[PDB]
Amino acid sequence: NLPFLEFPGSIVYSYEASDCSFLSEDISMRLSDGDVVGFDMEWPPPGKRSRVAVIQLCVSESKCYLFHISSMSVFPQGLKMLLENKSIKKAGVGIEGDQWKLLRDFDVKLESFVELTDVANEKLKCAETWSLNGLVKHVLGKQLLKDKSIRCSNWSNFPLTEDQKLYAATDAYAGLIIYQKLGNLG
């Protein structure tokens, strides 16, 4: 039985473009070249495809932002700047796929992403095909709630439920903690 990893800080939920741009600029102002944030995204699972509904940025153990873009009529300009900011790193798992998706859906270019599975394969010197949960178990010795119920819930629904918020925040948080873990190994 492995302990369950959960974001323990404050979750800042933003579903309006202006509010989101303001918070994003605030993040940009508090960070500098070399800094990193935990990053992740969610979206609901005939002919039409589902677009990114939520973007998570965990700047620290005490604060994680959830940007409900599916509820925004215009993509947050401040969020766009932050994401395209090469000075700030975004750590995650399967994050190149996130970048691709962001470009396709909103023509937003995620800059300076850090694929944690590659960092792990090179540091831990192992050739493994990972899942975020699997990486948390091996690196953090913890577990992640991953039942379809929440993982595959309708992320475009407003508002996000308390379970959705904690799950989305925890996925970004896991990225930040794994990044710190691997980046400071000795």
Q: Which residues bind Zn ion (CB under 5 A)?
A: 40, 171
Cβ closest to Zn ion, residue 66 vs residue 171: 171
Cβ closest to Zn ion, residue 94 vs residue 183: 94
Consult the annotation and say whether 42 binds a ligand.
Answer: yes
What is the C-alpha separation between 43 and 131, in angstroms, rounded? Answer: 18
Burial of 34 (0-12, 13-18, 19+ CB in 10 A): exposed
End-to-end CA, the chain: 27
Structure tokens at 17: 């473009």
Please give the distance of CA 173 from its chain centroid, rounded to a whole number: 7
Cβ closest to Zn ion, residue 40 vs residue 75: 40
| Nearest distance from C-beta of residue 116 to Zn ion, angstroms | 11
Q: Which residue is it, tokens 């508090």?
A: 30
Contact between 101 and 52 under an 8 Å Cβ cutoff? The reply is yes
Consult the annotation and say whether 33 binds a ligand.
Answer: no
Cβ closest to Zn ion, residue 40 vs residue 58: 40
Consult the annotation and say whether 171 binds a ligand.
Answer: yes
Cβ closest to Zn ion, residue 75 vs residue 155: 155
3-state secondary structure of 4: strand
| Nearest distance from C-beta of residue 103 to Zn ion, angstroms | 16
Structure tokens at 20: 């989101």
| Nearest distance from C-beta of residue 100 to Zn ion, angstroms | 12
| Nearest distance from C-beta of residue 40 to Zn ion, angstroms | 4
Q: ω into residue 45 within 30 of 0, thus cis?
A: no
| Nearest distance from C-beta of residue 16 to Zn ion, angstroms | 22
Tell me which residue has its CB nearest to Zn ion.
171
Binding residues for Zn(2+): 40, 42, 171
